Design a protein around this ligand. Structure first.
Ligand code: NAI
Ligand code: NAI
Ligand code: 3SL
Ligand code: 3SL
Ligand code: ZN
Ligand code: ZN
Lengths: 436, 436
């Protein structure tokens, strides 16, 4: 008993090829021609001819008129993000353990050296994105943080994005957008400090560029056009459900809004209401959401909660709201989503700006295998070990034998050599020497 | 000043273009043609015309002659890997916290649904790799584990590789190698079970295939041709240092072996001994190690411990052995490596086969941003949140104001709507409505 009351023509997969073609071309050009290729893209794409690296004096000049009340809101949001980041940092521990007697092994948890953070600016200026990356990197104890945001409307970095970067602790700020920003941070163009990890959200081109540069750099997650899903039962309020879908639909023409419900009445009311709310939006938002709802919006009626879980996990939405009775059950049973909003009171926009948990989140089904940007994306979990000579009697003979079973004679000789050195009178079966 | 007593012509970067050209072509063919392309590659690259998925009966038949002693060694190794993996699992906790009053936020730690594991077989048959992936996935509580290894030496999967997969708990086993194996696991070809995460080591083509498919799937880490670095002071034994370098140089022509030392006498003796040890290897190993040492081997003399740390962190070796006095200091000060071997007694081959910590590890500098395969690579760290209505007074007004500063009116309306529903008599500043 599963019925599409609204089916989308397009999905997050639809625009893959378009993004990949552009990114392949631009990365090739930037690899070949470095800073010059980037300055050319900045000019042709973003109308930008000025300096790319902002000086401290420029940062101060460009934020000097940012009012106290704006700064207070941004500062409060930075605190909430920092508070939760520090809680997440405490959840991953170092340890050591004894395995075979005399074998000590452990886990070190160490921050990366350099992070590059992207904050988008195109349709809107992503003030909150600016602190989501930088504040988290600082909470992780990352020593160098480089931050980029696109020149905005043929001017420079939006001043509130700039304030957010500075207030959150960015060490270097560049007026640089899109693929060329992501590439510049990966290769250390302009700063001479190649990033270890590049993070942050953006359009399909930005997200693909990061996906492509994985390997050269670590990343947080594939964080492309915003997605919202709501699970609702008959207790939900259609006006609020509809509002919440429209809230993320304004992000752009490619943003999916998904409703999974056990109530046809709720589905019906929401489908009537969403167009009405969209029609009351201002121009830019109405442009985005009209196309997004039409092309990517879906409404799925389900017979049981179990069916809702199955569909929701398959969709693996960036953001998942749950407006139902018995919220404990939903927290226990849902397994694929970026960020979960339990109950009507919280909502995606709160998470976007100031709840505390990061908003930089998996899209296009990446929630099947990753959560969002967090301190965990900046910590390396490395292993170490140490042995007594006694431990090597067992460990070394097993190693020699398995190595020789595999055909790895030089491996086995490293065990032979220790056995002969440490225990010259011992006689073990170290495996028949490899002859080929 | 840092002196290269042996400089390499080649580095892990040298063969990037070669690997990328092949992988681009094969992944295009498999995307377009599916199983047909995979069957074609299995035949053309690996000489294989047989069925690809093994039945339970084939698994039994192909392992029925594996001797008790071989099974006992493999079983011991699986236990060590499992023991350490369970300890790692305990190191990442779920939690919840109060942020702003009435805001509850938490972290859920959930295993992925399907993992695909690759165990290489080409120059050698990677028995240990077979349990490194599968046993770790099972320790993480992954419910479906798909495992591939290449047809080897005119037969199917090497029988000891197959025993390792079975004993470690693989649900599905495929006789399937290389790029076609990685792609089949990513797309769920032959099983109808697309992986959420694909893991495991291989040659440059395997590693590039995984790196390229990132996004479609999650991965552990870029785990390509094996690397070994040794840090040594004057207390080290050159015979053991040389043996350890040669141990990993046998992996293939592209395996780098690096010595970082403060002792000129040690460097000199190791440089004399390494060729002598290589000359005494059987043919496959001698073929690999001669080329590897010549082309990729490096010996670097440093004045101070601090210089050694700086160079070692820059190289970011998959494996790092430390044959020095004062091992505590090295543990405290080194920061970029895959897996650390403190003291002479343990050694890379032990970690490869049976110490416990995973051997599937970052190469080509990936240790700057990730540790190895571990249970952590199978867990998703997701966030959830829940609010009282009261919490939304602060959270909602900050959200509305910031949203409107960014130009996101629909976002702000979701806050407005809650404020009107929950607190109709409140009169907070919710920001100037966006008009454009
Ligand atoms: N997944 C997540 O956690 C989040 C996702 N987002 C998403 O970020 C996106 C922001 O998109 P935008 O407003 O476009 O800002 P953006 O900053 O991502 O993109 C602007 C940059 O892209 C370049 N660009 C645009 N079209 C291009 C083309 N055809 N070829 C090459 N370069 C091109 C521009 O010249 C500029 O440099 C939205 O879709 C939003 O939903 C926002 C926040 C978080
Ligand atoms: N980073 C790590 O943790 C580890 C790395 N390794 C590395 O794994 C590697 C194993 O390499 P192999 O013996 O080659 O086994 P493999 O299993 O990686 O490769 C064999 C497969 O690759 C295919 N292949 C080989 N050359 C090809 C080409 N030119 N075009 C397309 N397909 C091609 C073969 O047909 C076959 O399917 C070694 O370099 C070893 O050092 C081993 C264990 C762990
Ligand atoms: O997809 C996201 O995380 C966005 O909703 C965040 S923001 O609205 O751009 O702040
Ligand atoms: O790079 C590696 O981890 C290898 O040394 C592991 S094995 O020798 O192939 O087991
Ligand atoms: Zn949003
Ligand atoms: Zn090895």
């Amino acid at each position: 008993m599963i019925s599409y009351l609204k089916k989308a023509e397009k999905t997050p997969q639809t625009e893959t090829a378009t993004a990949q073609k552009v990114v392949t071309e631009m990365l090739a050009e930037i690899q070949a021609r470095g800073k010059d290729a980037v300055r050319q893209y900045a000019k042709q794409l973003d109308g930008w001819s000025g300096d790319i690296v902002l000086t401290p004096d420029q940062i101060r000049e460009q934020t000097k008129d940012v009012p106290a009340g704006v700064r207070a809101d941004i500062d409060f949001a930075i605190r909430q993000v920092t508070d939760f980041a520090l809680a997440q940092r405490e959840s991953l521990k170092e340890f050591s353990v004894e395995l075979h007697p005399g074998v000590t092994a452990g886990q070190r948890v160490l921050p990366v050296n350099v992070v590059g953070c992207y904050a988008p600016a195109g349709r809107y200026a992503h003030i909150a994105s600016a602190y989501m990356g930088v504040a988290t990197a600082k909470a992780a104890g990352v020593k160098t943080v480089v931050a980029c945001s696109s020149p905005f409307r043929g001017q420079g970095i939006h001043p509130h994005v700039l304030y957010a970067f500075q207030a959150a602790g960015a060490d270097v700020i560049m007026a640089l957008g899109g693929v060329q920003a992501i590439a510049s941070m990966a290769y250390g163009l302009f700063t001479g400090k190649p990033a270890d990890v590049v993070v942050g959200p953006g359009n399909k081109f930005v997200a693909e560029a990061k996906r492509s540069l994985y390997g050269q750099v670590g990343i947080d997650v594939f964080a492309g056009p915003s997605e919202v899903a709501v699970i609702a039962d008959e207790t939900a309020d259609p006006a609020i459900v509809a509002s919440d879908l429209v809230g993320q639909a304004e992000h752009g023409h490619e943003s999916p809004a998904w409703l999974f419900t056990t109530s046809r009445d709720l589905a019906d009311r929401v489908m009537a209401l969403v167009p009405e709310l969209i029609a009351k939006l201002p121009p830019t938002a109405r442009d985005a959401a009209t196309a997004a709802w039409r092309d990517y919006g879906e409404v799925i009626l389900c017979g049981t909660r179990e069916e809702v879980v199955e569909i929701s996990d398959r969709y693996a939405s960036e953001h998942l709201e749950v407006h139902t009775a018995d919220l404990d059950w939903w927290l226990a049973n849902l397994t694929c989503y970026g960020s979960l909003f339990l109950g009507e009171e919280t909502t995606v926009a709160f998470g976007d700006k100031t709840s505390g948990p990061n908003h930089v989140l998996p899209t296009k089904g990446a929630a099947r295998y990753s959560g969002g940007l967090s301190v965990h994306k900046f910590m390396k979990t490395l292993t170490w070990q140490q042995m007594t000579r006694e431990a090597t009697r067992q460990i070394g003979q097993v190693t020699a034998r398995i190595s020789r079973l595999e055909g790895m004679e030089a491996h086995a000789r490293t065990a032979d050599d220790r056995m002969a050195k440490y225990f010259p009178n011992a006689s073990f079966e170290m495996g028949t020497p490899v002859e080929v």
